[PDB]
Amino acid sequence: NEIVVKGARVHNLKNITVRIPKNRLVVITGVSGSGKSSLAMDTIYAEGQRRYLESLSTYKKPDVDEIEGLSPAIAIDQKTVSHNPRSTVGTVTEIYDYLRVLYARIGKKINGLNIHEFTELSISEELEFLKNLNLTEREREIVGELLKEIEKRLEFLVDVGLEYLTLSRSATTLSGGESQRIRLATQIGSGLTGVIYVLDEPTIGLHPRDTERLIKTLKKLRDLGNTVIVVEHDEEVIRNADHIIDIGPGGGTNGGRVVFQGTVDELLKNPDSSLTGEYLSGKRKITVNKTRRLPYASLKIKGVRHNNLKNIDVEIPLGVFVCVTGVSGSGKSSLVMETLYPALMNLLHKTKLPAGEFDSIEGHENIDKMIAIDQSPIGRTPRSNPATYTKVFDEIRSLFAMTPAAKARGYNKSRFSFNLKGGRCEACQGQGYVKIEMLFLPDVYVECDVCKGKRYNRETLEITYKGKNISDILDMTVDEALEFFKNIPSIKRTLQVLHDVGLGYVKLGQPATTLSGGEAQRIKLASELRKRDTGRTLYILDEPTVGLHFEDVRKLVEVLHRLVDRGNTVIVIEHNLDVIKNADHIIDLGPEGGKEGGYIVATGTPEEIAKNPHSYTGRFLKNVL
Ligand SMILES: Nc1ncnc2c1ncn2[C@@H]1O[C@H](COP(=O)(O)OP(=O)(O)O)[C@@H](O)[C@H]1O
Ligand SMILES: Nc1ncnc2c1ncn2[C@@H]1O[C@H](COP(=O)(O)OP(=O)(O)O)[C@@H](O)[C@H]1O
Ligand SMILES: [Zn+2]
């Protein structure tokens, strides 16, 4: 049987009708902004969940005509995460309750450890502890099958690359990738069948060493009797699909269409319609830089012992492209984000950030500035958008104020701000939607019926520049606007860097709160790229390929080489081999995650790492060099 999506029009989807096989591993592919999430999350998941919830007591619809063959749907992404600070790995996985029943059926301690002490072992240690239990002959008969269930659920955590976590770990201290995979392990452990699962890039944060095991886990989720829809860019996940849906042909206005549908073999046989197929067949490639850079100096952080780091000294060559690599849990974010970054902020720029344990830093005088480019949002209210954040909107407002019609009406540039009274729609605060005054719980946000969502009063909307009013400009994608304003240098420059980091599909007025973490990071990256005379700035970026198709990664790599070419240093934490194979220098941590990680397993060029038999990263690098 099949899901039949009829007349899908959410965002840039071109009123498409798509048939999707059920009880299959379906991989949705395509460049950023092509419409993968619009189809899989905003249409299929949303409607499947909505139709189930409408069966409840006492009880929104996406822009779509109908969906045949729908089932209740469950999403696994970075938004389906716990916000309860009380929650731990043990509680969000539902393993803690099983442990409670186990301890109530045996005693306060089991083989020397109480329950809290059990939860403080890593997952692999917990598994070995339980499997080395045969303390009794009849307690077996009261907990036996129960232990099996506990073991089953722990094994699923190992299977999604999280063996280094403890059950006692606070859920809010997990990364987005860790949270996604925790939820995957919990959903497969639940054994629920008959649902449509929609997963957003479940390889985020996962080393290639673990990809195959993740793929087996996705197939087990399928084999329970579920449809498993995965939005993914990873080549191996794509090659393991039962069915591929490739969205394109491009992003933004140039996207919203299914350009290929069928098996992997069919995609390889006829790839010239899809970028995805061209990369998969080798017709298109992210190039390996064949001139590795040498550093002009280095800095060195000594005695790092934060978390599992094994009292390591780490040298950062400056003026080159640096990747920090290694399996998940090996210590990369502990080293880079939680020790080196705050320690250099404190030395160079206004201290007082807490930093992981370490002895000293030498050579920090060899850089002038330390800037993190992370995935935290660019703003917290829809009053922020890409145009205001990069501050090109101030230039667009001046331009509108300079039209003959605006000057004759007395409209200065403030008239064209939706954050100031005057030109903005005062009913909807200059946002386009109003709430219902209940008393406080998440109310409905209905579209403003005065302005119809356009954010400005009708008088302000009468001013046009080349037939477009200010609302029209906010509805342009970056690429549209980049063509529209190509004769205005200050505007074109900002729009150009947004296009160069791969955000040509993003609308100028998209509210900050709807942007993914990767999109926020790339906007901030474009802001840094736009600046002149940065010189000896060290930039740190954590996993900047989240959300990125092959072509998007090609763009990201070009941008990073541009930053380094103008004298900067770049450190990225990555698992992506197309980025790593472009590094001038790699610091590979591990060998494993947790207690058996935290060592420096290898350093040097991609070629040197590839030659190192102790490096998992080098083992996969070998095949792309
Ligand atoms: N919440 C939103 N509001 C308005 N436009 C959006 C929103 N989310 C995505 N878009 C736009 O819709 C188009 C498709 O986006 P999306 O479905 O997220 O692409 P993908 O998942 O393929 O990266 C893009 O031009 C994007 O900028
Ligand atoms: N609150 C915490 N935040 C981050 N890591 C933690 C925390 N508590 C313990 N750790 C551990 O530190 C070790 C290294 O983790 P991390 O630096 O996150 O690895 P990576 O970034 O390579 O995936 C892991 O064993 C991880 O479980
Ligand atoms: Zn309004």
Author numbering: 2 to 60, 69 to 117, 400 to 916
Text from the published report:
The UvrA2 dimer finds lesions in DNA and initiates nucleotide excision repair. UvrA2 is also an ATPase from the ATP-binding cassette (ABC) family of proteins, which have a distinctive composite nucleotide-binding site for coupling ATP binding and hydrolysis to conformational changes. UvrA2 is an unusual member of this family in that it has two ATPase sites per monomer instead of one, resulting in a total of four sites on the dimer. The two sites on each monomer are termed ‘proximal’ and ‘distal’, and each site comprises an ATP-binding domain with Walker A and B motifs and a signature domain with the ABC signature motif.
UvrA2 structures from different organisms have been determined in nucleotide-free, P2ADP-D2ADP or Pempty-D2ADP state, with most in open conformation (including the T. maritima UvrA2 structure reported here) with a shallow and wide DNA binding surface, and one structure (in complex with UvrB) in closed conformation with a deep and narrow DNA binding surface. UvrA2 structures determined in open form are in either nucleotide-free, fully ADP-bound or, in one case, in Pempty-D2ADP state, suggesting that ATP hydrolysis by one or both ATPase sites favors this conformation (the fully ADP-bound structure reported here further supports this hypothesis). Nucleotide-bound/free UvrA2 structures reveal signature domain II in different conformations, suggesting it could affect ATPase-driven changes in UvrA2 interactions with DNA and UvrB. Such dynamism has not been reported for distal site signature domain I. A C-terminal zinc-binding hairpin within the proximal site signature domain II also adopts different conformations and is implicated in ATPase-modulated interactions of UvrA2 with damaged DNA (the UvrA2 structure reported here shows the hairpin in a new, intermediate position). To gain additional insights into the finding that nucleotides are held more tightly by the distal ATPase sites than proximal sites, we interrogated atomic models of several UvrA2 orthologs for underlying sources of the differential affinity. Detailed examination of the complete set of contacts between UvrA2 and nucleotide at all the sites revealed 21 polar and 28 hydrophobic contacts per site, on average (both proximal and distal sites make 21 polar contacts, and 29 and 27 hydrophobic contacts, respectively). These contacts are highly conserved between the two types of sites and between orthologs, with one notable exception. The proximal site has a glutamine residue that precedes the ABC signature motif by five residues (Q821, G. stearothermophilus residue numbering). In contrast, the distal ATPase site of every UvrA2 ortholog features an arginine in the equivalent position, which is involved in a pi–cation interaction with the aromatic base of adenine (R480). While both residues stack on the adenine base, the more extensive interaction and pi–cation stacking by R480 implicate this residue in the higher affinity of distal sites for nucleotides.
